[PDB]
Amino acid sequence: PQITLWKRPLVTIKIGGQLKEALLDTGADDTIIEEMSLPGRWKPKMVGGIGGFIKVRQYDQIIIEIAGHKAIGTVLVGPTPINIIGRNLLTQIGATLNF
Amino acid sequence: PQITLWKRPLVTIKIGGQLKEALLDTGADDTIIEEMSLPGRWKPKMVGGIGGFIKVRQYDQIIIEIAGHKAIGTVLVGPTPINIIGRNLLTQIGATLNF
Ligand SMILES: CC(C)CN(C[C@@H](O)[C@H](Cc1ccccc1)NC(=O)O[C@H]1CCOC1)S(=O)(=O)c1ccc(N)cc1
Q: Does the keyword Manganese apply (chains A, B) (predicted)?
């Protein structure tokens, strides 16, 4: 699709067999989702945003369905105001910005 | 142009007669620029994201040239770690997210 930006670019994602809403965020380097249980071991990671840094849990090789497109990669879990799909996954689905 | 997301989508902008580098951010509702002097009255506002909230000054009807494209709208000025071009101005230049 071609998504205009008059409204927040929200899509449905499927992760852990659950359906969730997420923001397509070109300004986020990584993908961060709200607290949920994911499989595997995690590593610590410091993530910087508008108000400073936070501590999140990094899970690798996670299967995630983004607006019907399947992707497999790194997902961070932590206290985010909204589920964000960052560049790491946007590239996997071949998303670009055009103007 | 067609911007791939392997790297951060930075562009050159012109605001208040100064040249700055900024992030084309679909996850940002509004544009936020690092501390600078702008003409006009302004209203204080609080903006939040990852890491909490920052206090900014809201300037209205500011003209900004985004990669050679002139646009007009609200600009928030404050202690942001990076200059962000949000949806309020991306729409004006006809930017879309495609996949
Ligand atoms: C958190 C989302 C919902 C909103 N933010 C936009 C996001 O694109 C934000 C942009 C940014 C990049 C680098 C440093 C600081 C900020 N990236 C972000 O947090 O990157 C983290 C998450 C994964 O990788 C690192 S915002 O900055 O809080 C914001 C809020 C309101 C306005 N009007 C403008 C901006």
A: no
Active site residues of B: 25
B77 shares contact with chain A (CB less than 8 Å): no
As given in the structure block, the two tokens for residue B87 are 């949806």
Q: Say yes or no for a CB contact (<8 Å) between A5 and B27.
A: no
Structure tokens at B29: 């509702």
Q: Determine whether the shortest distance from the Cβ of A27 to ligand 1 is under 6 A.
A: yes
Contacts of A36 (CB under 8 A, 6+ apart): A15, A16, A18, A77
Resolution (A): 1.9
Strands (E), chain B: 2-3, 10-15, 18-24, 31-33, 43-49, 52-66, 69-77, 84-85, 96-98
Q: Between A3, A50, A96, which is nearest B51 by CB?
A: A50
Answer whether A96's CB lies under 8 Å from B3's CB: yes
Contact present, A35 and A79 (Cβ < 8 Å): yes
